[PDB]
Symmetry: C2
Subunit: 313 residues, 2 copies
């Protein structure tokens, strides 16, 4: 009965433009489907969760790449708003030792979203997910914030404040905005790197405790190779990392999101009441699935999350 309820992901869908060598031996940019909320919808799709995607998607050929990717991962993107504006591009370049970024998001299909584009949300939507860059950008951010505010009292809200300082150099109004978004979330997952960008005092375990009093019932901090720690009002759950050979980490965190949600969905715990009474074991299963799933992704030039027929054992 809970099994057919949908998780509706709301946020950015973009193209990661990553440097590769041509056969001629020179630098080119290879287009990958991407975006944190997008990547999470894909991973939820591949895990067999009924998944929706609300966003602004272009009708150009890059938009085509995104819709094709969603469709092949069984994500329902009928919610999405299609226009003739271009697709967001995120450029990564290697200069000497380090990466440099260029964010091409002028007048895009994603950025120029409108209140009128807001989707109808009925009782078959058990949970919704929001991300950082789309919530912070203007004018689309106003739309997603509105949507989050409206449905927060009705449904499970998952928030991933993935700070991308490299894409958009972050300021206070961004940390200010994100902070007042946290209040509206039931589940919050962020990396230890993300949490540091918030200027808050104390231990990581201490910060999590403050946020649990702000409305979230579950806070998850991810620690790269070292796995993650999950915090609620009833427990703290360390989950060890998994050793694997890493090609890259694009979309790794997004897969963690998906595993946590898929497990809770599967366990039939995606209600506000059930999240308030999670046992230690239920928390561990969710975060562990998240970690296992991300193990696969980092292996093969992700964002390329695992199908559920992968991870079979």
């Amino acid at each position: 009965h809970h099994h057919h309820h949908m998780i509706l992901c709301c946020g950015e869908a973009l193209i990661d433009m990553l440097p590769r060598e041509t056969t001629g031996g020179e630098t080119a940019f290879q287009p990958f489907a991407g975006g944190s909320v997008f990547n999470t919808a894909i991973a939820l799709g591949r895990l067999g969760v009924p998944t929706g995607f609300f966003s602004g998607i272009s009708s150009d050929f890059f938009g085509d790449v995104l819709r094709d990717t969603l469709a092949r991962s069984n994500v329902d993107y009928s919610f999405a708003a299609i226009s003739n504006r271009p697709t967001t591009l995120a450029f990564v370049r290697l200069v000497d030792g380090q990466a440099r970024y260029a964010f091409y998001d002028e007048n895009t299909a994603g950025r120029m979203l409108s209140r009128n584009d807001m989707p109808y949300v009925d009782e078959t939507i058990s949970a919704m997910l929001f991300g950082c860059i789309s919530l912070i950008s203007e004018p689309c951010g106003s739309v997603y914030e509105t949507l989050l505010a409206r449905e927060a009292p009705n449904r499970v809200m998952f928030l991933d404040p993935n700070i991308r300082a490299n894409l958009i150099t972050v300021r206070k109004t961004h940390l200010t905005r994100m902070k007042r978004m946290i209040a509206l979330a039931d589940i919050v997952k962020l990396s230890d790197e993300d949490l540091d960008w918030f200027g808050e005092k104390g231990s990581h375990d201490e910060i999590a405790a403050e946020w649990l009093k702000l409305g979230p019932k579950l806070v998850v901090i991810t620690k790269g190779a070292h796995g993650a720690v999950a915090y609620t009002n009833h427990a703290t759950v360390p989950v060890p990392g998994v050793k694997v050979d890493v090609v890259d980490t694009v979309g790794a965190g997004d897969t963690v999101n998906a595993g946590i949600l898929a497990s809770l969905h599967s366990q039939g715990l995606l209600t506000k009441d059930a999240l308030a009474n999670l046992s230690e074991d239920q928390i561990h299963s969710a975060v562990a699935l998240g970690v296992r799933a991300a193990a696969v992704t980092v292996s093969r030039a992700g964002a390329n999350p695992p199908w559920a027929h992968e991870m079979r054992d």
Copy 2:
């Protein structure tokens, strides 16, 4: 004395994003410096003509590619207006048999040019050059049109209406605008493909005759492999093509522009009076240089025009 006068190119500078294969065996886009007026400035630079470039150039890394390319071809781009807006991108993709295009020009450094950015033009500027896409785009087009109108009475104007239907599907106001630009030009060069987009009656040789009455003293129609025909009020000059093995044709026409101008510059004929009295031989030398120079470009994945120390014999 005429030898130190500068040709000032005014128009777009963009990045051609062309499909290549990665070592991994998949499609990527390789960034090339490009833009018709840009390509022409480069070629004039490499031919040893004192050359200027007025345009809108980004401060991002794509903008860096363009400034580096200009600098290494000895083009003076101090006239250019630098801002923090992104660089124009022109995507080409091969789908089945044919090419498909995507033009990414939202809120760019090039497109958002202003009246205030207009350059000071003194008596050391013998000639100026304008192109199509920048003259048609808004709001930058208003700026270039203004500039052309102001300096037309003072200096030699060269106009290249290179129609790019694939980049921007062309409408009447574009043909209307281009047409009323032609009046202000002393030299006009366009391809037979370009001329067809104008809906005008009669033979190509007939059309050229009409335009010569509109103000232009010299009209050149290029015919791909078959070379070109040059028209004035005193003569008609067929110039045969050159047989070469062609890698591509990006920037070919732009090199023709440069050779015509370089030759006239060298011959000391870049004045309104001298263009009104060109002999048959003087016309032939100019257009022939244009054709020879373009022979080199089409050979090596241009826009990559010849240095004058190439073409040495």
